[PDB]
Amino acid sequence: MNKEEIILSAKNWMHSHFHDWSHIKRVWKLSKEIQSKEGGDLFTIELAALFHDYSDQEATKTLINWMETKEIPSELIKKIIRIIQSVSALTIEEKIVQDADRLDAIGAIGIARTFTYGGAHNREIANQNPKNTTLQHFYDKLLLIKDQLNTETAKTIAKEKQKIMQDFIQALEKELKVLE
Amino acid sequence: MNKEEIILSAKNWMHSHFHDWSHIKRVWKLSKEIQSKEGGDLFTIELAALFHDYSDQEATKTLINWMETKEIPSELIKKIIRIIQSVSALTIEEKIVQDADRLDAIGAIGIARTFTYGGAHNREIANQNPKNTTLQHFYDKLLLIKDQLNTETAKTIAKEKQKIMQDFIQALEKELKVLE
Numbered sequence: 001m002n003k004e005e006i007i008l009s010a011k012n013w014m015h016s017h018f019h020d021w022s023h024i025k026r027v028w029k030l031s032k033e034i035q036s037k038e039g040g041d042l043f044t045i046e047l048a049a050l051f052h053d054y055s056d057q058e059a060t061k062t063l064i065n066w067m068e069t070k071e072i073p074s075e076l077i078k079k080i081i082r083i084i085q086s087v088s089a090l091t092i093e094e095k096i097v098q099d100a101d102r103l104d105a106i107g108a109i110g111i112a113r114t115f116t117y118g119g120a121h122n123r124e125i126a127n128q129n130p131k132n133t134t135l136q137h138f139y140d141k142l143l144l145i146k147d148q149l150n151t152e153t154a155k156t157i158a159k160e161k162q163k164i165m166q167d168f169i170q171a172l173e174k175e176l177k178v179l180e
Numbered sequence: 181m182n183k184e185e186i187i188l189s190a191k192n193w194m195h196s197h198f199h200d201w202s203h204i205k206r207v208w209k210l211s212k213e214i215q216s217k218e219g220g221d222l223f224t225i226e227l228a229a230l231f232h233d234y235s236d237q238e239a240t241k242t243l244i245n246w247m248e249t250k251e252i253p254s255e256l257i258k259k260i261i262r263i264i265q266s267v268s269a270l271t272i273e274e275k276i277v278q279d280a281d282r283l284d285a286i287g288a289i290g291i292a293r294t295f296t297y298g299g300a301h302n303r304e305i306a307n308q309n310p311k312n313t314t315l316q317h318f319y320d321k322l323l324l325i326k327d328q329l330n331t332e333t334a335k336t337i338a339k340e341k342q343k344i345m346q347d348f349i350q351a352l353e354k355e356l357k358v359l360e
């Protein structure tokens with residue numbers, strides 16, 4: 001099996017099947033970056049990352065098929081699938097991908113993504129008088145993600161993100177009541 | 181006519197009729213703040229601000245009615261309506277309200293509002309390879325608003341906003357391609 005080629009194929013396959021594709025390719029780039037400092041089977045990581053968002057049980061069986069057809073030892077297929085499960089006792093590969101996923105939920109992308117999501121489920125931006133307001137989602141989940149990360153590399157590439165997010169929030173609650 | 185009371189009534193009427201109510205009350209608070217430094221008929225401003233978002237020709241005729249019923253000289257009704265038109269040769273009152281409206285389109289609120297809007301019209305967050313991406317809306321309109329403002333007071337209460345917005349954008353385009 002030619003790893004470089006298989007990756008390329010998987011990449012082109014997911015692309016012509018798509019949040020959007022932009023999201024996947026980010027989790028892919030992100031997990032790639034993380035491994036270069038946390039180690040692990042890069043090939044096993046790169047695919048789990050690219051397929052982490054396809055399972056939404058036939059879909060799963062479809063991937064296995066596509067993978068057996070590529071002649072990937074059934075041992076790798078097993079790991080790759082096990083990883084996808086811990087995403088959407090953890091091996092580093094399962095940690096990396098899961099970290100790369102969470103990382104794309106916070107920071108500037110997080111803000112944009114979470115507010116775009118709210119705009120498709122009628123979730124009030126905020127509400128001083130906060131049970132389901134998007135703003136509260138930042139205090140309940142988002143802001144907490146940065147710490148739940150299970151990788152130091154992931155944690156440092158989360159720093160700049162956890163910052164702008166913090167600044168964004170401060171600025172929101174401030175101009176959300178008009179203070180001056 | 182009791183101005184303080186009429187304002188209260190208009191306030192309670194728009195409230196039980198609602199972007200959401202949060203938006204109107206902000207444009208109201210915002211225009212109030214601005215006038216305290218730019219002058220103008222506060223009463224004429226306060227109502228145009230509260231009704232600036234109701235015209236969406238019967239609606240217009242409904243307001244006039246509600247206003248004549250409050251015994252507001254037909255001269256004020258005229259101005260108040262003229263203002264609402266320049267919002268959704270400009271007197272300062274028309275400038276203030278229009279400034280207060282634009283102000284709520286940028287800054288943290290802007291980001292949140294524009295991304296929530298995109299999430300209800302399927303507007304891709306961004307796209308490096310930008311004709312309709314929400315990101316581009318920042319370069320085409322939003323970022324430009326801060327300068328189109330026709331009031332110095334408005335311009336300074338736009339400073340903090342134009343900043344976080346600038347920071348947010350920088351941070352977006354940066355983590356949108358994963359740079360490190």
Ligand SMILES: [Mg+2]
Pocket residue numbers: 019023027052053101
């Ligand atoms: Mg995902």
Ligand SMILES: [Mg+2]
Pocket residue numbers: 199203207232233281
């Ligand atoms: Mg408005």
